[PDB]
Design an enzyme around this catalytic site. Structure first.
Site, PDB file in Angstrom:
ATOM      1  N   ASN A 157      -4.738  -7.803  -4.585  1.00  0.00           N
ATOM      2  CA  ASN A 157      -5.141  -6.413  -4.530  1.00  0.00           C
ATOM      3  C   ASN A 157      -4.069  -5.515  -5.116  1.00  0.00           C
ATOM      4  O   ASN A 157      -2.884  -5.847  -5.214  1.00  0.00           O
ATOM      5  CB  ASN A 157      -5.584  -5.945  -3.124  1.00  0.00           C
ATOM      6  CG  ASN A 157      -4.539  -6.201  -2.057  1.00  0.00           C
ATOM      7  OD1 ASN A 157      -3.392  -5.788  -2.175  1.00  0.00           O
ATOM      8  ND2 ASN A 157      -4.948  -6.871  -0.985  1.00  0.00           N
ATOM      9  N   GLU A 183      22.114   1.533   6.106  1.00  0.00           N
ATOM     10  CA  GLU A 183      20.753   1.137   5.697  1.00  0.00           C
ATOM     11  C   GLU A 183      20.254   1.957   4.514  1.00  0.00           C
ATOM     12  O   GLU A 183      19.065   1.950   4.195  1.00  0.00           O
ATOM     13  CB  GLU A 183      19.788   1.321   6.883  1.00  0.00           C
ATOM     14  CG  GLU A 183      19.624   2.802   7.326  1.00  0.00           C
ATOM     15  CD  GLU A 183      20.539   3.230   8.491  1.00  0.00           C
ATOM     16  OE1 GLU A 183      21.645   2.664   8.714  1.00  0.00           O
ATOM     17  OE2 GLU A 183      20.159   4.195   9.194  1.00  0.00           O
ATOM     18  N   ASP A 211      26.093   0.739  11.065  1.00  0.00           N
ATOM     19  CA  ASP A 211      25.225   1.924  11.252  1.00  0.00           C
ATOM     20  C   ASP A 211      25.373   2.957  10.118  1.00  0.00           C
ATOM     21  O   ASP A 211      24.410   3.427   9.556  1.00  0.00           O
ATOM     22  CB  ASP A 211      25.543   2.565  12.631  1.00  0.00           C
ATOM     23  CG  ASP A 211      24.856   3.931  12.865  1.00  0.00           C
ATOM     24  OD1 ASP A 211      23.709   4.161  12.402  1.00  0.00           O
ATOM     25  OD2 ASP A 211      25.462   4.767  13.586  1.00  0.00           O
ATOM     26  N   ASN A 235      17.252   6.387  13.609  1.00  0.00           N
ATOM     27  CA  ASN A 235      18.439   5.758  13.046  1.00  0.00           C
ATOM     28  C   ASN A 235      18.373   4.215  13.067  1.00  0.00           C
ATOM     29  O   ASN A 235      18.064   3.583  14.088  1.00  0.00           O
ATOM     30  CB  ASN A 235      19.696   6.256  13.766  1.00  0.00           C
ATOM     31  CG  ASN A 235      20.951   5.710  13.140  1.00  0.00           C
ATOM     32  OD1 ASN A 235      21.059   5.660  11.928  1.00  0.00           O
ATOM     33  ND2 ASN A 235      21.885   5.271  13.954  1.00  0.00           N
ATOM     34  N   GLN A 236      18.634   3.617  11.917  1.00  0.00           N
ATOM     35  CA  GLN A 236      18.644   2.177  11.777  1.00  0.00           C
ATOM     36  C   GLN A 236      20.086   1.694  11.653  1.00  0.00           C
ATOM     37  O   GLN A 236      21.040   2.489  11.548  1.00  0.00           O
ATOM     38  CB  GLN A 236      17.855   1.750  10.523  1.00  0.00           C
ATOM     39  CG  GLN A 236      16.425   2.278  10.460  1.00  0.00           C
ATOM     40  CD  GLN A 236      15.487   1.528  11.384  1.00  0.00           C
ATOM     41  OE1 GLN A 236      15.262   0.333  11.201  1.00  0.00           O
ATOM     42  NE2 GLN A 236      14.935   2.219  12.379  1.00  0.00           N
ATOM     43  N   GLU A 262     -11.271   0.213  -4.000  1.00  0.00           N
ATOM     44  CA  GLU A 262     -10.431   0.690  -2.894  1.00  0.00           C
ATOM     45  C   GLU A 262      -9.312   1.541  -3.491  1.00  0.00           C
ATOM     46  O   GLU A 262      -9.346   1.856  -4.670  1.00  0.00           O
ATOM     47  CB  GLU A 262      -9.838  -0.514  -2.142  1.00  0.00           C
ATOM     48  CG  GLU A 262      -9.143  -1.526  -3.054  1.00  0.00           C
ATOM     49  CD  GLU A 262      -8.542  -2.689  -2.274  1.00  0.00           C
ATOM     50  OE1 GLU A 262      -8.193  -2.463  -1.099  1.00  0.00           O
ATOM     51  OE2 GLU A 262      -8.398  -3.798  -2.833  1.00  0.00           O
ATOM     52  N   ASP A 275       0.820  -1.231   0.000  1.00  0.00           N
ATOM     53  CA  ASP A 275       0.000   0.000   0.000  1.00  0.00           C
ATOM     54  C   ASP A 275       0.853   1.281   0.000  1.00  0.00           C
ATOM     55  O   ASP A 275       0.660   2.170   0.848  1.00  0.00           O
ATOM     56  CB  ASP A 275      -0.946   0.015   1.193  1.00  0.00           C
ATOM     57  CG  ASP A 275      -1.769  -1.229   1.305  1.00  0.00           C
ATOM     58  OD1 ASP A 275      -2.169  -1.845   0.267  1.00  0.00           O
ATOM     59  OD2 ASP A 275      -2.025  -1.589   2.460  1.00  0.00           O
ATOM     60  N   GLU A 305      24.122   6.410   5.661  1.00  0.00           N
ATOM     61  CA  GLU A 305      23.635   5.341   6.522  1.00  0.00           C
ATOM     62  C   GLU A 305      23.940   3.999   5.846  1.00  0.00           C
ATOM     63  O   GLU A 305      23.808   3.866   4.641  1.00  0.00           O
ATOM     64  CB  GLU A 305      22.130   5.513   6.745  1.00  0.00           C
ATOM     65  CG  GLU A 305      21.752   6.790   7.494  1.00  0.00           C
ATOM     66  CD  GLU A 305      22.603   7.031   8.737  1.00  0.00           C
ATOM     67  OE1 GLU A 305      22.800   6.108   9.570  1.00  0.00           O
ATOM     68  OE2 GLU A 305      23.097   8.146   8.884  1.00  0.00           O
TER      69      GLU A 305
END
Ligand SMILES: O[C@@H]1[C@@H](O)[C@H](O[C@@H]2CO[C@@H](O[C@@H]3CO[C@@H](O[C@@H]4CO[C@@H](O)[C@H](O)[C@H]4O)[C@H](O)[C@H]3O)[C@H](O)[C@H]2O)OC[C@H]1O
Ligand SMILES: [Ca+2]
Ligand code: NA
Ligand code: NA
Length: 488
Positions: A289, A362, A481, A384-385, A226, A25, A360
């Site tokens: 969907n 990530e 990190d 932060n990931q 939808e 979605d 990052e």
């Protein structure tokens, strides 16, 4: 040294946007040179014996957020714990009244000279809520403590599924909320109920974006199902939605495809035009969907949509678990929209990445096969990931890092490790030119962070950059990190 394979987003391909988890979605925010994608938190449900069962939407209580400056490298901003009822997100979870946060919509509006952000979501099929923040990634506040829109909101009765919000801020600063779907007639709609559900709605928002003004209008989207969407192209408002699957359909309203309607006003009247995105099953096999948002980022029109391309690759059946894709969307001279050529190749990287800023970990284009979480690293951006679930032979890669003519002198990585490992810095491919090897020491633990520096040589010009993780035994080698190269 790099042995893990890509699940579904293969090197060189831009779809799905991510494959190291799911995201259904999708909706897009374009803000200060980045596209944010906000997604329903698709997450595998399991039978008690550990096998996967079909998605029943049980895990859709967070909003996943990724962003990109370039359509290829995605920064994982992690999860917003939107749903706080039942109760769980373990505490944490921001809208205490909501057990679910399906199908987000995002808006930004400058209020009192400061950019304010508004995240909308459906508490399943029962109402729309909103969170607010001073940045696109939070932190988030629930101003209201209750749904923003319910079946009691004026104009909202007659909506079967009060969900799939789309919030659009018009050029004049006026917000509008589109919502609704479902088909009346319960287990047996008549043909005419299929053909005109009359369950789509638009309502004007108040200036503060956390209230409504007046009543909702019905949008009579033929074969409405939808997935309300709103974009504005060349002064015309395009209301798009997913066409339902039931009844007989005319050739121009094919079941499960994205239909669209136009109007010269955000609240209508809308006229069906109008289909531009086949069911994801038509492209990737077959099917489910279908769920979409049209946006313009760095001067190009795109649609973000979902497909079961990661789950199908892992399981041999998509089982309702969905992943974000983007493809270009093309408006014709007459304002009609061409069929979107949904595929795996997706969108070609639109700008290079600068490897001399903090980047990052990530933030990557491809991976095989890691996870991202919530980091304990001191400092860092909001939410932060870090990259985790790093085993020997795993890797991540960024597309088109531009080291420039002078090239890099060193590579820094912020890492936390119990036993240590290595980060091989390679160009172009997972087995490509080794420009450096960062020795990750024992830092004292997975939550004890050290910025390590190592030499780089041979890193000039534009390349995909692979960070290939090696180490012995384990387990999780280290968490990862951010990184930064130095010039020259
Ligand atoms: O609690 C309410 C939920 O149940 C309701 O969930 C909705 C259930 O319908 C979802 O739509 C599905 C999409 O798949 C369609 O079948 C496809 C037909 O073609 C085949 O090729 C393909 O394999 C099939 O998957 C199915 O007809 C249709 O119902 C919809 O997205 C959900 O929202 O949501 C609201 C809650 O209040
Ligand atoms: Ca990080
Ligand atoms: Na949406
Ligand atoms: Na891994």
């Amino acid at each position: 040294s790099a042995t893990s394979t890509t699940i579904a987003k293969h090197i060189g391909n831009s779809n799905p946007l991510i494959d190291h988890h799911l995201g259904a979605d999708p909706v897009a925010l374009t803000y200060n040179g980045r596209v944010y994608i906000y997604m329903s938190s698709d997450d595998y449900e399991y039978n008690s014996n550990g096998t996967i069962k079909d998605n029943s939407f049980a895990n859709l209580n967070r909003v996943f957020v990724i962003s990109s400056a370039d359509m290829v490298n995605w920064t994982d901003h992690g999860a917003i714990p939107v749903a706080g009822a039942n109760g769980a997100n373990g505490g944490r979870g921001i809208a205490k009244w909501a057990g679910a946060s399906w199908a987000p919509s995002i808006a930004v509006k400058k209020i009192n000279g400061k950019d304010k952000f508004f995240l909308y979501f459906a508490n399943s099929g029962g109402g729309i809520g909103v969170l607010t923040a001073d940045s696109p990634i939070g932190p988030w506040t629930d101003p209201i403590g209750k749904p923003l829109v319910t079946p009691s909101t004026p104009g909202m009765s007659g909506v079967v599924w009060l969900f799939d919000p789309a919030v659009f801020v018009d050029d004049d600063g006026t917000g509008y909320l589109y919502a609704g779907g479902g088909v009346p007639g319960v287990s047996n709609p008549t043909q005419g109920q299929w053909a005109n559900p009359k369950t789509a709605r638009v309502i004007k928002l108040g200036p503060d974006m956390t209230s409504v003004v007046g009543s909702a209008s019905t949008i009579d989207a033929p074969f409405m199902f939808e997935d309300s969407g709103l974009h504005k192209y060349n002064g015309t408002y395009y209301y798009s939605y997913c066409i339902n699957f039931g009844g007989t359909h005319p050739a121009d309203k094919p079941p499960g495809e994205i239909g669209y309607m136009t109007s010269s006003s955000p609240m209508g009247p809308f006229t069906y035009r109008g289909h531009f995105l086949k069911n994801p099953g038509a492209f990737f096999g077959g099917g489910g969907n279908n769920h979409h948002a049209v946006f313009n980022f760095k001067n190009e029109w795109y649609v973000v949509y979902h497909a079961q391309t990661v789950s199908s690759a892992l399981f041999g059946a998509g089982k309702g678990y969905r992943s974000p894709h983007i493809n270009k969307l093309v408006h014709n001279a007459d304002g009609s929209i061409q069929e979107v050529a949904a595929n795996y190749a997706g969108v070609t990287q639109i700008s290079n990445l600068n490897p001399y800023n903090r980047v990052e970990a990530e933030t990557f284009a491809w991976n095989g096969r890691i996870l991202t979480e919530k980091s304990t690293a001191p400092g860092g951006p909001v939410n932060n990931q870090h990259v985790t679930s790093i085993q020997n032979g795993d890797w991540i890669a960024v597309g088109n890092a531009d080291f420039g003519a002078g090239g890099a002198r060193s590579f820094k990585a912020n890492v936390a490790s119990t036993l240590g490992g290595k980060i091989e810095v390679r160009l172009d491919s997972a087995d490509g030119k080794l420009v450096g090897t960062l020795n990750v020491p024992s830092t004292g633990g997975a939550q004890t962070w050290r910025e390590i520096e190592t030499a780089v040589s041979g890193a000039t010009g534009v390349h995909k950059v692979f960070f290939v993780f090696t180490g012995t035994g384990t387990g999780n080698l280290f968490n990862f990190d951010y990184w930064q190269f130095t010039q020259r």
